[PDB]
Amino acid sequence: LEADVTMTGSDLVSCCYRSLAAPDLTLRDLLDIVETSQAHNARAQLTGALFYSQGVFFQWLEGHPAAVAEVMSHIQRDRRHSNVEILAEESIAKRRFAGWHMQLSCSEADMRSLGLAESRQ
């Protein structure tokens, strides 16, 4: 029996933001966002996930404070995601995620009737 490291995370921080996905957004913009953010998060040691439904964003990031902020300063110069109201930046221990996630991928499949494919013609 070996002892686990337990909650070891002195310098993590989790910025948890609420945004309202601007109508100026394109799927291609999300699909570009997702790809570049994973890559940055992987490097910056940031873990994450994203909840996007009804055009509203709940997205948060767990990482070492300044990385998170490096990320914040890179994101907060947006116009993409309606307001991006972080409003919550809290120092965490992290462990929860090992990678950042995004719901929007190459299509969503089936749930398109709830926003994507509103009408035909």
Ligand X SMILES: Cc1cc2nc3c(=O)[nH]c(=O)nc-3n(C[C@H](O)[C@H](O)[C@@H](O)COP(=O)(O)OP(=O)(O)OC[C@H]3O[C@@H](n4cnc5c(N)ncnc54)[C@H](O)[C@@H]3O)c2cc1C
74-93 mask for ligand X (x: CB under 6 A)? xx--x-xx------------
Which residue from 18, 47, 26 is spatially nearest to 116, judged by alpha carbons? 26
Tell whether residue 71 is a contact of ligand X (CB under 6 A).
yes
Count of residues interacting with ligand X (CB under 6 A)? 16
Q: Which is nearer to ligand X, 2 or 29 (CB)?
A: 29
Considering the complex, what minimum distance in angstroms separates the CB of residue 57 from ligand X?
A: 5
Q: Which is nearer to ligand X, 14 or 41 (CB)?
A: 41
Residue 59 annotated as lining a ligand binding site: yes
The Cα–Cα gap between 115 and 35 comes to: 22
Considering the complex, what minimum distance in angstroms separates the CB of residue 26 from ligand X?
A: 11
Bridge-based pairing state of the strands 47-53 and 12-19: unpaired
16 close to 86: Cβ distance less than 8 angstroms: yes
Tell whether residue 100 is a contact of ligand X (CB under 6 A).
yes
Instruction: Pull the structure tokens for residue 79.
Output: 């116009």
18 close to 68: Cβ distance less than 8 angstroms: no
